[PDB]
Amino acid sequence: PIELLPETPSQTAGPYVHIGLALEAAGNPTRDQEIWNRLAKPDAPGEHILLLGQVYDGNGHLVRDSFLEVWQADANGEYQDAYNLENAFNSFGRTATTFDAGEWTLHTVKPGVVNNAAGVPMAPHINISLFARGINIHLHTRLYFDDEAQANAKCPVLNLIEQPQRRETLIAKRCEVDGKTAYRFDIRIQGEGETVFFDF
Amino acid sequence: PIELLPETPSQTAGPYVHIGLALEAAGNPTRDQEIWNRLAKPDAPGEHILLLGQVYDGNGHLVRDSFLEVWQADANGEYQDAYNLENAFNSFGRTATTFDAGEWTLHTVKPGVVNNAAGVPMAPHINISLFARGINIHLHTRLYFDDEAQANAKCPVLNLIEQPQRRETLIAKRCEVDGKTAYRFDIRIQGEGETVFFDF
Amino acid sequence: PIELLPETPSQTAGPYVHIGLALEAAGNPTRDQEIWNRLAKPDAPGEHILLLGQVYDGNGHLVRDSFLEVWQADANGEYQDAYNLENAFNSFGRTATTFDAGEWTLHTVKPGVVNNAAGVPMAPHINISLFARGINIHLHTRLYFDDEAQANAKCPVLNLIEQPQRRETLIAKRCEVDGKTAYRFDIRIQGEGETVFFDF
Amino acid sequence: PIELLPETPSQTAGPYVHIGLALEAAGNPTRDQEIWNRLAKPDAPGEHILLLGQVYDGNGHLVRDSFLEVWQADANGEYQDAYNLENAFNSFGRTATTFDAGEWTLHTVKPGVVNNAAGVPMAPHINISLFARGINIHLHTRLYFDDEAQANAKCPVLNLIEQPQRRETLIAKRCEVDGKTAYRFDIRIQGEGETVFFDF
Amino acid sequence: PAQDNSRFVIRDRNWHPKALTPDYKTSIARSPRQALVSIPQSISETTGPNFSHLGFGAHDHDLLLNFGLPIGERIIVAGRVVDQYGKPVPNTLVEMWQANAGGRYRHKNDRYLAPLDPNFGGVGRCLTDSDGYYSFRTIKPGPHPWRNGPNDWRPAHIHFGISGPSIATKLITQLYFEGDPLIPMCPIVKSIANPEAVQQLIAKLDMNNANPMDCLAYRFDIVLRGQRKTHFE
Amino acid sequence: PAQDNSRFVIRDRNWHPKALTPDYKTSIARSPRQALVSIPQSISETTGPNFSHLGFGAHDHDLLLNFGLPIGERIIVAGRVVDQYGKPVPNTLVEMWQANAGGRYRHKNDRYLAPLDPNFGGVGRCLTDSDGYYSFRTIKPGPHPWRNGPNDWRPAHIHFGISGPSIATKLITQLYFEGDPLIPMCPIVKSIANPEAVQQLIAKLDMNNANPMDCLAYRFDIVLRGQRKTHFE
Amino acid sequence: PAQDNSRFVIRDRNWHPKALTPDYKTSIARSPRQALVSIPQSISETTGPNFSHLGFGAHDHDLLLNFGLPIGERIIVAGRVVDQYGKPVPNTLVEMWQANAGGRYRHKNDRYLAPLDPNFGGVGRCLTDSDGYYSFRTIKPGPHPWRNGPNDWRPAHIHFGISGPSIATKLITQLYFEGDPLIPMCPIVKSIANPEAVQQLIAKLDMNNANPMDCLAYRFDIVLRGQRKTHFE
Ligand SMILES: [Fe+3]
Ligand SMILES: [Fe+3]
Ligand SMILES: [Fe+3]
Ligand SMILES: [Fe+3]
């Protein structure tokens, strides 16, 4: 058969990832412009929400050295690829968990609906990529919302997960933090309640 | 790079180890002098104690064919390398678990403190090596004492174990057997509450 | 290591180089436009000078079949790369030595100063490349002026030559031909007073 | 034939030999004990002499980065191998030529006579080993004295050198320095008056 | 906004290191035990951020000046980012981090006894040019011990993160240096099963790109997943 | 005026022939005994003449018409000029000269007994096109005896001079013809130590470029020093 | 005093580099043109100094302490000194010198732009033990540019001087590091015609001698001229 050039192989991000990708978090001087955890400016249209979570290893211990990358649509269900700190809203961001802060936080807006390749609407969701020492190749997942049950029931992506019980691992639980709409999304890398990860 | 001669590969002790290393336990005639489970004679200095434990496999079942070897300093924090049955204290000994007895026992004294190579004191501990059928290469562990919380907190070795939960697995529980001071140290080879094993 | 395609290897220009590159000199019909020894037109700005010299071999015998190429800045220290016979000045030219005329001549103007990569000024100089039967790969040298001691003393290139005695081999000696300003630059390929040759 | 382990291949001493073998000369702080240019303390038996010289390359240019080691017998024709700064005389020493000092100097005594393997007397001489950048394997020579004509004539080593003319290259010329008895020994590595070098 | 016009060649998960590679101790507790769920590519996966407008500082990519001069071997690390079809990946973000010449990281948690270099930070970023080329100037990092086996040492290495055209192509990897004898002993390197794949992570000495009497150069090219147009969907 | 904006890859003096190659007698007395002095590239070394504006005659490149018809094998010699990076070198000057079919040069000093050809000059020039291509039409030169050893013969050859972008790139060489048995016997060829290097001077028969019932063709590509932009200087 | 009681196996001058090795330019004017004169061994040549009584300082052999801590890869260079017959050479003087982590030397003449390290001198000395063993603690030196060809770089190396039992055994050499890609390109290394000979100068990575979480180790054994007793003389 036909063989293209092989893709450069992946390697773990290692324990010091933060010095390269999360300057502030690493407690190191940052540059003029940094890609961080604030996707939305206070004036961005849409419902402003707060996302938070913890990452657990197979022993049920917190992962205090992870790095997370997020990608989501704006309130219109539109992906905004031109990254600029001047923008009211960016579709991309980065967050982390540290020895100092075992929990990550992201300031954004609830994503609008997007259609899959076949023209079927997917429920609102945030695409997540998880990196850390011990992870040879990054893990992909999706964050759905517990207040979109009607939508979740019909998502073609969620419907690909053979077992219903596993589907719930993808649902962030709505709460409030300082009288603000927040969602809690914990990731379990291994074992009991192991979060679903995708390949695409 | 420089390569030395390779070390002779390990092999499991097998199910009949007792015939070679634990004659009595094997219910076979012993020789004049045997290396067994009585490290100290009643007249040895230090706090006389009884050590006992059980060995569990991954299914939570008793390991009834194990063989153990211990190395510890005397009461004064000194290692007595000259093995002799005439001695009041021998730093080395051997014990086992049998079909007949699923629990092992050792008669010793609480060891004194010894410094690590960097001159930092280590909490009182007993060095253990475990062998059995199903174990291809012997397992190394340490037994520490619950009534030494202060020393334990600062042990350079215990402190190398990343998760505090894991450290607890090396702590023997003080008790009394026939109203005599004893400590119980159970070993879980696999799974829930799996005991920390070392490499050195 | 990374290896690029190999440069085509050099070969001696051979005994007849004149037929290909010095038509007149070769006593053969010339073409409409030829590249020769008149770099400056009477009306070119700068001090008009006449360059002359002999080329000696290792036994001190004249080399009557050499071919030389020159590259120099104009009076303003500028390299004029767009070669055109209409130009009052061309930064490039060609000369030779024949059995007929064992001394080469070049009509030009004294070059202006140019800076090295580091921004330091070089003493006025002419770059020269020498070819001839018996020379497998051309030789590179530079012609400097005896009437520019001040500059010469500071030239970062001249200063790269370890032995001061060797530096003098690069200095053309001022004179006059027909009461015209001239400079004589003899090249010694081998032996006594051998001319400095560069690699770059 | 029988082959033994090959000797480790030699390499040039390089341009900074001074930092490793001639601290002072190098102008770096010295250690407590340094092997240097004074073989005889003022109260050493024998005739106190001063040795000096220059080293020349193939072009007749001074070699300003040479390093020389010397080995000679005491006044009684005895080799004193036990090196000690406390000794009135050491048979071994080191000197150098530098950018600052183009001439090396040695403070010693005129060596007594020693016999060759066959029992024949050798004329008074100093064994020299020369090192420097550009020299891949050190050069061995011998320094003889002009005031020992009779002995020189019968030297079985000097006599191995086929041409009388070459023999002279090895004779130090008596002089006086600050009314002190001195001998000048210039070394010419290559060309006209090239000094004899040995193999043994 | 971004459009769903491309498809990315499926990853070869036998080429990349697996999740569980026991000699690399930390991977045991950090590898999923369930199979990964495969999903069709949609706009969510085939799009990603474009960093053409991020405001890059003048010395963002020059580790010699972005933090006197650091001590260590002065090198230029350069290469090109192309896809599996061999097409250049223009204007893509390349981020890198490393230790100093002594193998010490400028991070709290690094207690290695080799000192910090007052003039060295060890973080850089560069946007590829029209042709997919990037370059950094830095000092060659030193190997460093780590608590894995009792005497484990990572070979000298530089951490790299590449964005590519989509979240589907985003990759984090590590560069190693030609001839390093530590390479074959490293359990992180050995997480990779095919030796042919290991070869792709080795930067080659590049005398052609070196600055004489200044610094040496290493060449490291990166291949992201092949991008094709959707067809007959 | 020209500007200093490029650097050239350092030549490999172990690839090119050495100065002293004793079998080639004339080299004994014309080879320097001191070492070349290495100097850093500056605007003086990295610029050179551009011959784009020289006025070339219509048959400058046609030795069949530039001097009846000459006697001998009608051939085209074509090829491309690229740098070490594989980049084409456009508008560069290519000059050649050779003997006639009998191995006689049109030069006073040539006293070989093979006659001159009244219709043959043996001089040509061509500026490369936008793709670095050049071509000539001539007749295949014959071997010629020369006074080196007692029975020395030069393989049939064509002399070449190529300008390139700078004086650093300029080069003079010789083309030889595929299969000529005299090649391995020539002390001039032999001035080159590496056999792989000799192969680069051999022109290959090119039937694809030949004109049926008219003339054959040979392909001879040339590689000049690799040119790159300056960085971190 | 010393006595003439031994003979040394004659040197193989085809194994050692020759005097004239033109690619290493300074060797052209510093190589004798006349042949060496062979002489029989006498007391003059078979004896040498014994350094057993030199008063060495406590850190003479520890470059980490003998000049804060130096920046760079912490290593131990250890090995044994033996003769051709495989016999240890006890209580012999071993001296070494090198550059810092950046290839910079602590000498007036070293103008390279890489900074000096305020905590590194680069000189050591050690007396072999009863078994012929020596060891030093230092940092791995960096390659350095030098003016030979226009882009020459010495491989990372350490200069060694060994006394041995006589002036006939005295040697000066250089140690190179396993896998360094610069090795094959070095005109100095190439002064050695035999590849097998070159291999003898490469120090091997020695994980067995390393101190976990502290420093790596390299092994470099030295072979001096065989020493035998006189017979039938
Ligand atoms: Fe790292
Ligand atoms: Fe058995
Ligand atoms: Fe010819
Ligand atoms: Fe050196």
From Swiss-Prot, chains A, B, C, D:
**Cofactor: how and how many bound:** Binds Fe(3+) ion per subunit.
Under CDD domains, the record lists: 3_4-PCD_alpha
Stored PROSITE patterns? INTRADIOL_DIOXYGENAS
**What's the name of the protein?**
Protocatechuate 3,4-dioxygenase alpha chain
Task performed by this protein: Plays an essential role in the utilization of numerous aromatic and hydroaromatic compounds via the beta-ketoadipate pathway.
**GO BP terms, alphabetized:** beta-ketoadipate pathway
Q: In which pathway does it act?
A: Aromatic compound metabolism; beta-ketoadipate pathway; 3-carboxy-cis,cis-muconate from 3,4-dihydroxybenzoate: step 1/1
Gene3D superfamilies on file:
Aromatic compound dioxygenase
Quickly give the catalysed reaction. 3,4-dihydroxybenzoate + O2 = 3-carboxy-cis,cis-muconate + 2 H(+)
Which Pfam families is this protein grouped with? Dioxygenase_C (PF00775)
Q: Which family does it belong to?
A: Belongs to the intradiol ring-cleavage dioxygenase family.
Q: Which domain of life is it from?
A: Bacteria
The gene that this protein is the product of is: pcaG
> What molecular function terms (GO) are annotated for this protein?
ferric iron binding; protocatechuate 3,4-dioxygenase activity
Enzyme Commission no: 1.13.11.3
Coiled-coil regions listed: none
Q: What is the lineage of its organism?
A: Bacteria, Pseudomonadati, Pseudomonadota, Gammaproteobacteria, Pseudomonadales
Q: Which InterPro entries match?
A: Intradiol_dOase_C (IPR000627), Intradiol_dOase_core (IPR015889), Intradiol_RC_Dioxygenase (IPR050770), Protocat_dOase_a (IPR012786)
> Which PANTHER family does the record cross-reference, listed alphabetically?
DIOXYGENASE, PUTATIVE (AFU_ORTHOLOGUE AFUA_2G02910)-RELATED (PTHR33711), PROTOCATECHUATE 3,4-DIOXYGENASE ALPHA CHAIN (PTHR33711:SF9)
Curated annotation (Swiss-Prot), chains E, F, G:
What's the cofactor? Fe(3+)
UniProt keyword Ubl conjugation present? no
Q: Which SUPFAM superfamilies match?
A: Aromatic compound dioxygenase
Q: Which reaction does it catalyse?
A: 3,4-dihydroxybenzoate + O2 = 3-carboxy-cis,cis-muconate + 2 H(+)
- State where Fe cation binds: Y105, H144, H157, H159
Q: Which InterPro entries match?
A: Intradiol_dOase_C (IPR000627), Intradiol_dOase_core (IPR015889), Intradiol_RC_Dioxygenase (IPR050770), PCDO_beta_N (IPR024756), Protocat_dOase_b (IPR012785)
Annotated EC: 1.13.11.3
Would I find Cell cycle among this entry's keywords? no
Keywords of the record, alphabetical order, are: Aromatic hydrocarbons catabolism, Dioxygenase, Iron, Metal-binding, Oxidoreductase
Q: Which GO terms describe its molecular function?
A: ferric iron binding; protocatechuate 3,4-dioxygenase activity
Query: What is written in the cofactor note of this entry?
Result: Binds Fe(3+) ion per subunit.
Gene Ontology biological process terms in this record: 3,4-dihydroxybenzoate catabolic process; beta-ketoadipate pathway
User: What is its pathway?
Assistant: Aromatic compound metabolism; beta-ketoadipate pathway; 3-carboxy-cis,cis-muconate from 3,4-dihydroxybenzoate: step 1/1
Reading the lineage from the top rank, the first entry is Bacteria
The similarity annotation says: Belongs to the intradiol ring-cleavage dioxygenase family.
Kindly state the subunit structure of this protein: The enzyme is an oligomer of 12 copies of the alpha and beta chains.
This molecule's function is given as: Plays an essential role in the utilization of numerous aromatic and hydroaromatic compounds via the beta-ketoadipate pathway.
Any idea what this protein is called? Protocatechuate 3,4-dioxygenase beta chain
